[PDB]
Amino acid sequence: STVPPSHYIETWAKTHPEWKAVEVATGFIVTEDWTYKKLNETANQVANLIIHASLHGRAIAVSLDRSLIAFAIIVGIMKSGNTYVPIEAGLPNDRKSFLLRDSRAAMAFVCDNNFDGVELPPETKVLDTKNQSFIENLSTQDTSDILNNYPENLDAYLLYTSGTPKGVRVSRHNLSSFSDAWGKLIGNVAPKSLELGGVGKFLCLASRAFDVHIGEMFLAWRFGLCAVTGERLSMLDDLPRTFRELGVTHAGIVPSLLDQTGLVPEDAPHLVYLGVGGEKMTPRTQQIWSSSDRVALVNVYGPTEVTIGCSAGRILPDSDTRCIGHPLGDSVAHVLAPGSNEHVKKGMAGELVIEGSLVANGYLNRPDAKGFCDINGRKMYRTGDIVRMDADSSILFLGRK
Ligand SMILES: [Cl-]
């Protein structure tokens, strides 16, 4: 058992209510922000709105701009004991319609005609976050913390992955174990992180199509940082400007974006921690970023089905770039013969199979999609990835099964 996903939000709201929790950047730089106290109150109001609609354990879809209230809606959905279902605002209408329907969304928070031309399921109650009436009703809800006593395995979010997309059900326990495991890893490899409460910032750069965006905001809150974000086209336009002008101290990026932009550590003067993942980094990226004594560079392995990042390791100038490090928190990595449940001798190639608190609940209504299973009566996920363990038990990524 674990503290809930919104635990650190509530904790910093009590101990340091004036710290900034979220900030959204315009202009391109003008910004606006909310304190932990304000973020937490608004999320409780959102949660109370949801509870008044009698929704429990229901899919609540969100298709919003990059706004302060978006963050409060996400947290609110989780405080109300319901499931967050991100739907990227730029998706084609047909694909938005499918996600609403497949997820059985009971309610949706939208703005900006993001749902214009989307077929809504009749069950979907649609709230426009920019509508004077919705704002007035929200401001009228109670602001105290919700009594948060939901089962551990209750879904916290549903994240769709690929021609018919399948929904991955991620539990409260999964997400809260993620925050705990990464709080520990990041605090260890980038100790300045424990000094940055109230000052540092975690750049929320990921598209809402990926679980990474959830990780970014909850890791910011874990450490007392400000989650900072903007319209993605605007943040990506001049990536050095974004890191430099928004005071970013922590970020996650796919490394080819470092290559394309020519980013170096001096373009991000406040940066102390840089997670990369999702593809192998190039030799020059490694040379440039792995030798800094200010920035800790960490390679992260993270299928959606195992909650954002379940293995990671610091990358140094002599590290193999296929190394995905060691399992996080209580996770246990096994390397099994691709066709059986038999462990291979350490050092041999085989399929990576993860066990532990980061393994997701499963796919939503996709009985033929494989990967989740019981192996020796424990819950595991077979990644489809071929790896081998190094002598020191770190894991090298070799390819796809
Ligand atoms: Cl929560």
Side-chain angles (χ1 to χ4, degrees), residues 4-6 78-79 148 172:
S6 71
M78 282 175 210
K79 279 169 179 264
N148 184 317
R172 296 176 69 74

Side-chain angles (χ1 to χ4, degrees), residues 68 142 163 354:
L68 300 167
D142 199 80
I354 313 297

Side-chain angles (χ1 to χ4, degrees), residues 62-77:
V62 177
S63 197
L64 291 176
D65 58 349
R66 295 232 174 194
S67 62
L68 300 167
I69 197 169
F71 292 106
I73 282 158
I74 296 169
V75 169
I77 284 166

Side-chain angles (χ1 to χ4, degrees), residues 17-260:
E18 77 288 356
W19 284 3
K20 307 309 187 171
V22 295
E23 173 172 28
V24 302
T26 344
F28 282 105
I29 298 190
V30 188
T31 80
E32 63 181 16
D33 52 27
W34 278 348
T35 56
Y36 273 89
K37 171 173 183 294
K38 178 65 171 165
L39 172 61
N40 189 58
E41 291 161 350
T42 305
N44 291 329
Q45 293 184 311
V46 167
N48 275 316
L49 201 49
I50 291 165
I51 287 154
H52 286 336
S54 296
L55 307 180
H56 310 296
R58 312 282 289 283
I60 311 271
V62 177
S63 197
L64 291 176
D65 58 349
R66 295 232 174 194
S67 62
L68 300 167
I69 197 169
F71 292 106
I73 282 158
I74 296 169
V75 169
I77 284 166
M78 282 175 210
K79 279 169 179 264
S80 68
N82 287 281
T83 298
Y84 164 52
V85 187
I87 288 171
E88 154 195 1
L91 274 183
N93 294 8
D94 266 3
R95 314 225 317 120
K96 290 186 177 123
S97 285
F98 188 63
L99 299 179
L100 293 177
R101 189 163 53 243
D102 186 72
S103 63
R104 269 77 184 174
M107 162 177 290
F109 290 91
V110 312
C111 61
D112 290 342
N113 319 117
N114 285 335
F115 266 18
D116 273 34
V118 181
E119 280 102 336
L120 312 171
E123 68 276 37
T124 312
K125 161 60 159 156
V126 174
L127 296 178
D128 173 5
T129 57
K130 289 185 205 178
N131 168 281
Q132 207 194 266
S133 144
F134 162 85
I135 299 175
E136 259 136 30
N137 185 235
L138 183 71
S139 73
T140 253
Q141 308 297 319
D142 199 80
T143 51
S144 313
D145 286 350
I146 309 302
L147 308 178
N148 184 317
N149 228 20
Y150 307 116
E152 291 277 348
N153 67 344
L154 191 61
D155 292 340
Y157 66 88
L158 175 65
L159 201 125
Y160 274 90
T161 197
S162 49
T164 302
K166 60 190 174 193
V168 183
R169 298 169 55 226
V170 179
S171 78
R172 296 176 69 74
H173 188 77
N174 291 149
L175 174 52
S176 79
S177 304
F178 167 90
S179 289
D180 188 73
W182 282 88
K184 288 170 172 168
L185 178 134
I186 289 173
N188 174 93
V189 306
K192 172 93 170 131
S193 295
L194 313 165
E195 285 223 328
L196 283 167
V199 177
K201 302 204 191 169
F202 209 124
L203 177 66
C204 295
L205 185 50
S207 170
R208 286 152 174 192
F210 307 115
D211 56 359
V212 176
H213 83 273
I214 288 160
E216 287 167 333
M217 70 188 58
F218 279 93
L219 292 186
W221 298 326
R222 169 70 182 77
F223 281 110
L225 317 175
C226 186
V228 65
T229 200
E231 172 164 13
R232 297 190 90 229
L233 283 184
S234 280
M235 300 181 282
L236 283 166
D237 193 3
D238 180 349
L239 199 48
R241 187 198 195 190
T242 294
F243 274 88
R244 180 184 72 249
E245 301 290 327
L246 296 184
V248 169
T249 59
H250 296 63
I253 192 159
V254 311
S256 56
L257 198 51
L258 297 170
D259 283 320
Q260 180 181 345

